[PDB]
Amino acid sequence: PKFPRVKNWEVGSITYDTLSAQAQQDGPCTPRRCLGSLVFPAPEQLLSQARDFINQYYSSIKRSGSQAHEQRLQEVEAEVAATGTYQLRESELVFGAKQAWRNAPRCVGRIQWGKLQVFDARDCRSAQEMFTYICNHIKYATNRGNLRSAITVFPQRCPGRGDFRIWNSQLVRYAGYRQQDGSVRGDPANVEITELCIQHGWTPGNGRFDVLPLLLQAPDEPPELFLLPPELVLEVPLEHPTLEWFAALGLRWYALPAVSNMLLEIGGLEFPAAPFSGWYMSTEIGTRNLCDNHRYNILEDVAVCMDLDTRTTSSLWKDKAAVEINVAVLHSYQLAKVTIVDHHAATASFMKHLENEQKARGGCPADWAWIVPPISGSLTPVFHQEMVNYFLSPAFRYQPDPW
Amino acid sequence: PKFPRVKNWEVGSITYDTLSAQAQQDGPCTPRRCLGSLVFPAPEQLLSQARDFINQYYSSIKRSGSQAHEQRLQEVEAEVAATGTYQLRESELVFGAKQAWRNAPRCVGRIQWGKLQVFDARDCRSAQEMFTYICNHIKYATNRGNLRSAITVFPQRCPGRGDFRIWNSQLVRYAGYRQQDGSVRGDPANVEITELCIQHGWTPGNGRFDVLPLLLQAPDEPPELFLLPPELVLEVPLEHPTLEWFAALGLRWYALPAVSNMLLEIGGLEFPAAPFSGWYMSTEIGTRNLCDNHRYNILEDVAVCMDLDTRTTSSLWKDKAAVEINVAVLHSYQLAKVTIVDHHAATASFMKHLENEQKARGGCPADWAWIVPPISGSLTPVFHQEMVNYFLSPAFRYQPDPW
Ligand code: HEM
Ligand code: HEM
Ligand SMILES: Cc1cc(N)nc2cc(-c3ccc4c(c3)CN(C)CCO4)ccc12
Ligand SMILES: Cc1cc(N)nc2cc(-c3ccc4c(c3)CN(C)CCO4)ccc12
Ligand SMILES: C[C@H](O)[C@H](O)[C@H]1CNc2nc(N)[nH]c(=O)c2N1
Ligand SMILES: C[C@H](O)[C@H](O)[C@H]1CNc2nc(N)[nH]c(=O)c2N1
Ligand SMILES: [Ca+2]
Ligand SMILES: [Ca+2]
Ligand SMILES: [Ca+2]
Ligand SMILES: [Cl-]
Ligand SMILES: [Cl-]
Ligand SMILES: [Gd]
Ligand SMILES: [Zn+2]
């Protein structure tokens, strides 16, 4: 209860999550009912979060209780007393961004958490400068297909001044053009941002894979529209290693998953614009983006081309077609020399992360429903691993739309 | 919080679960941390549970607050007064067994909950009579392959007297023989029960699909060994519709899923011996029982016979082999005229069940991790359905091993 027992049912091994008892915010579940599956769940309170964060920082460098540790706490206290807020040291920004990734319960890629390039954009002053920072991020992270995890963090929230915001949910997204019938051409997940781009002066295309422009918001200004140079946006045309007609579907996806609408919280400070990027796990593209019925929805078309019996569920035509689409994604990215990880390799690495984190901190916050991949769930080790979900800070958080 | 909002992300539809608010007991989650992924979470007290169940019963038959209702309440009160417990009427038992199934959050098959044959074995006296009840159950439920859902209810627990227990976790289980090289021949899940059968006088076999005897326990006298007549245990040899070598693997599974180690709780009364059965969803056999690494673990055997590239994860050889194993299960059961349901059909029916239960009770307790199938998760509609998990009574509960 205070220290929950956690069992792995494949191996029989047992751990106790002692870290969850330190959970700093509250989630949606109660003893009466679990809401784990739901997608969406000053000075002295600021100082409490700040002090805890400084403690985490000095612990991570094995200098807990040092003079420098004590002096930084007093320095933070003095700044909050004088200004009501404080400024992170450069080293604290880097550490805090890595901690926020480490703490993200829904991320299966966290074995990489210590390897994150942190771009400090806290002196950004305009939307134009914001765009320059974002382009340098995309160029660095993409690296001609040898992807590198990165985050750029723009100025923190402060009283008497609006937030920096990136209106787009990701730095690279395909347009979704809503038709008169209610159908969509392109990505149905992006209908709202597409219409906002048009409203703010973008001349729309009419393709299924039109890369959207960015809507960048500087403090107290309407969003400004910026087009990404096409040479900056690396894409992979999709082909299949043995189904030669697959290439004639004309499908593609982009190299760089870069989420831009989440809020980064470090030490009680809030960074509403802090886009971050890694590389794709193949099921995100091959299973969710392409096969979700409410996304590109290609499953029946692929099955029909494969000459599967789409008239009865028990032929497992959906399963067979989904598998080949995921094969196509892995083959195409590997052929293009663009970083990609399959769901077996990624979940294997996450098991090693759990072991590392059990030794380092006595547990790991993890959201089973998001860690288990959307195909072949029980064929991966994480399916059989019990998990404890809780909120630690530093953190990436959902935040309301700026419109 | 009181009435959780529940969203379907494929359709966009919204419901509010007003049934969760009536959750009688308490689960393992708290605002600090979610434990939803974990497998295992006074006459005045009995009267209170008995009272609420009788009300459920008379409400269910549209006889609320009537004379028969008022009379039954006072009869239980008087029976508790003279005995310390009370007896269900056979019709209340039928109602309660159906509600316990309806209330089971981890069961995807609950569209069928109103169709359940209840065998009243509460007059049972001995392990010999227990074996006859169980054999009648298996014969009725198997029905030469046209499976029918059923439950047999043995006498309730009572003070100063041992329980009836079925030591086996299922009525049909394959033996698990520990080999000298450390490995297991047969089903590794059943190593403990296999050794207990041998302990209690069973002459073991040496095959990979040897059906175990039953260890049956009458009150206070010890467990007795019983052999199931081979003609009563319907099995399905597994072949593949196009991979002719699949049959040569010698795989088989049994027709009847009949769980025998859970406790049934109705109106404060507890039945530690109440085996219940339905029919299989194909992923249970093809994915979990045959492909779990700690079960039969045949995935690589099949992939070698399919000439798949097993030295790289990104060939998705595990996924392709799993798909064909699941095809083999569906094809073999359909060819044998044994009832089976695929995971697409089953999850579609559960969505209809959720819709039914929203109108009837304002919600439905559902455990997302158990409802979503172990392959092709997001290809099924339940993956995109938010769910609320909570404990309602009457209920099936886990209980300690009788040894
Ligand atoms: C390096 C390779 C990475 C891989 C393979 C990876 C993989 C994933 C996957 C599969 C998800 C589930 C999202 C979905 O369902 O599509 C996810 C979520 C998430 N990832 Fe990672 N990730 C990586 C890097 C990163 C980085 C660099 C960060 C931040 C610095 C990060 C933070 C997050 C967060 C916050 C979520 C949850 C998003 C939400 O709740 O909406 N990830 N990741
Ligand atoms: C009629 C066809 C049925 C189907 C297709 C079905 C399907 C399933 C499935 C797939 C599970 C998940 C467990 C697993 O991974 O194997 C489950 C669990 C469960 N089922 Fe159903 N079931 C059926 C009938 C029944 C009946 C008749 C009852 C009781 C009267 C029942 C009660 C339960 C319970 C209590 C669980 C929870 C198991 C646990 O927590 O260990 N089911 N069922
Ligand atoms: C940094 C990073 C790397 C990576 N490889 N993937 C990521 C995926 C998300 C993500 C967050 C939410 C979300 C989805 C994906 C997709 N689902 C299908 C629908 C909408 O919900 C966030 C960050 C990622
Ligand atoms: C009535 C019925 C019908 C049906 N078709 N399946 C059922 C499955 C269970 C079940 C019970 C426990 C359990 C598991 C499944 C799953 N795995 C194998 C881990 C072990 O835990 C119980 C009753 C079922
Ligand atoms: C209803 C359900 O919680 C929702 O569809 C979740 C399930 N698990 C997921 N898991 C991942 N990785 N990504 C998702 O978007 C979702 N969606
Ligand atoms: C840890 C995890 O909750 C556990 O292994 C669950 C996951 N989902 C499951 N789902 C079903 N249907 N059956 C199971 O045994 C499990 N096991
Ligand atoms: Ca300063
Ligand atoms: Ca009778
Ligand atoms: Ca080979
Ligand atoms: Cl994506
Ligand atoms: Cl089973
Ligand atoms: Gd070909
Ligand atoms: Zn929970």
Numbering used by the authors:
A (entry chain B), B (entry chain A): 66 to 106, 119 to 480
The authors write:
Nitric oxide (NO) is an important signaling molecule critical in the cardiovascular, neuronal, and immune systems. Here, we used a combination of crystallography, mutagenesis, and computational methods to better understand the structural basis for these differences in NOS inhibitor binding.
The position of Asn606 in hnNOS corresponds to Pro370 in heNOS. However, the crystal structure of heNOS P370N bound with 4 revealed that the inhibitor still binds only at the active site while BH4 is undisturbed, just as in the wild-type heNOS-4 complex. Since the single residue variation between Asn606 in hnNOS and Pro370 in heNOS does not appear to be the reason for the backbone dynamic differences, we next analyzed the connection between BH4 binding and the structural changes induced by inhibitor binding in this region. Our mutagenesis results showed that this is not the case.
